[PDB]
Design a binder for this molecule. Structure first.
Ligand code: NXG
Ligand code: ZN
Length: 197
């Protein structure tokens, strides 16, 4: 079973947004619009914006899940490697096996799907802070793309779904992720490769 990755704005005009963080060697998280790909360091804060055209109902939630991008792997559950799942870096809420965490939200819930065994983290959808136009969720990715016995150099996608209180689909967006030591350099490289290709 592979979760859908079809972009779907839905009734509320749901879509993601990303900051413009640049590609300096020191940058810890940076998004490439050309590649639709986020590059980030291990366990560092990744701001992801939520934008809507109209207010979803109270009880709406926002779920994040990782899948493998490549066809021959998409069927395999994305999880932390055998080292990182045992390094006791728990925040008290996230299971140690989960790749994706939400940082600094006490209402975050972590799901191990009883049928697909896939992991996800879900939070309530909330309106922007006074003065802002969108809401920001802070994600952490808790393994490197290169982790042996884990992602093992396989590219992943994060799928973000807007859900009603029952879990029914209201909206969907997605982006590729590379968790790496030097996001700035890697983004610059992959953008250059694309331009040549
Ligand atoms: C520019 C003026 N229009 C856009 C055309 C509105 C701006 C105000 N927002 C309110 C709003 C509510 C929720 C929520 C919730 C749970 O009930 C989540 C988000 I992100 C959010 O932006 C709605 C859109
Ligand atoms: Zn790992």
């Amino acid at each position: 079973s592979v979760p859908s990755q079809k972009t779907y704005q839905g009734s509320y005009g749901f879509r993601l947004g990303f900051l413009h963080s640049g590609t300096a060697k020191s940058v810890t998280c940076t998004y490439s619009p050309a590649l639709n790909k986020l590059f980030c360091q291990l366990a560092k804060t990744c701001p992801v914006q939520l934008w809507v055209d109209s207010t979803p109902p109270p009880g709406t939630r926002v779920r994040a899940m990782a899948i493998y991008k490549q066809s021959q792997h998409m069927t395999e559950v994305v999880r932390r490697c055998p080292h990182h799942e045992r390094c006791s870096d728990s925040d008290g809420l996230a299971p140690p096996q989960h790749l994706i965490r939400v940082e600094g939200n006490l209402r975050a819930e972590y799901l191990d799907d009883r049928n697909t065994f896939r992991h996800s983290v879900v939070v309530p959808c909330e309106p922007p802070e006074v003065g802002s136009d969108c809401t920001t969720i802070h994600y952490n990715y808790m393994c490197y793309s290169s982790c042996m016995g884990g992602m093992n150099r396989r590219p992943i996608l994060t799928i973000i779904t807007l859900e009603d209180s029952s879990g029914n689909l209201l909206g969907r967006d997605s982006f590729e992720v590379r968790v790496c030591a030097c996001p700035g350099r890697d983004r610059r490289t992959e953008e250059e490769n694309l331009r040549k290709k």
